[PDB]
């Protein structure tokens, strides 16, 4: 029953999922001078245009936002990648104030929070063949900053309050990623794992050096979700990030 509370949370999951203690866990601290520039990295791809959203889920952990990965549409390329990596679905990490919430850390810098855009390696042929692979997933990890807002998000935002409780879900169509992109795509990369149960170390992680900025009153409608079901007591979905875990053997680089 994991979670991120005093009795199920991060530090605990190791119990039920010994990998949390293995070699190229997610998330790690990004050591800003530590990190090789790469000229090897190919130029990163993202191509959303033909993007199509399904649905919203709130999963008693984030909510999920998924798209239809039945035909090659929303793909990401290039980079460290090796062939074409399709979207199935994006989710945030966030915190209970402005000063936490991100996964991933910049010099141990947390950001308010952080977007997961989570791809699969289209040579497996679904998910769940790709995640017995250590190539087999693709997230591009965003951070966010508490600032101006960011149009392309309203539409999450507004939604929410129809998904406050785990597993609810509404139907989400036509919704744009594009509109959650910054401006760069300079990235640093690595690999390493699913940073919630079951922790598998399929990922190739591809985080963004340029945050986004949200504004303070969209991500506190974040803080308005519940992990809880409906009738349950209430428990707001805040602090749903694991913390920096190892390096071990691993060499983070720079696409910059
Ligand atoms: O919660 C998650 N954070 S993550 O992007 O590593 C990921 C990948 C796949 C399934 C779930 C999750
Ligand atoms: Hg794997
Ligand atoms: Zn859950
Ligand atoms: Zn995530």
Redesign the pocket.
Known sequence: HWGYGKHNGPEHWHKDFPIAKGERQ?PVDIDTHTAKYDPSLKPLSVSYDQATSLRILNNG??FNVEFDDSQDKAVLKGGPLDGTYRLIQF?F?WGSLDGQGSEHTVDKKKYAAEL?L?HWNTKYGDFGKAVQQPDG?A?LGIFLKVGSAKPGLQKVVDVLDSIKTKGKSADFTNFDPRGLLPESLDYWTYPG????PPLLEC?TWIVLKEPISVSSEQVLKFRKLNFNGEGEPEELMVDNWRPAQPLKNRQIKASF
């Open positions: 997610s952990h984030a989710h990490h997961h989570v997933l997230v794992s699913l940073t919630t990922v």
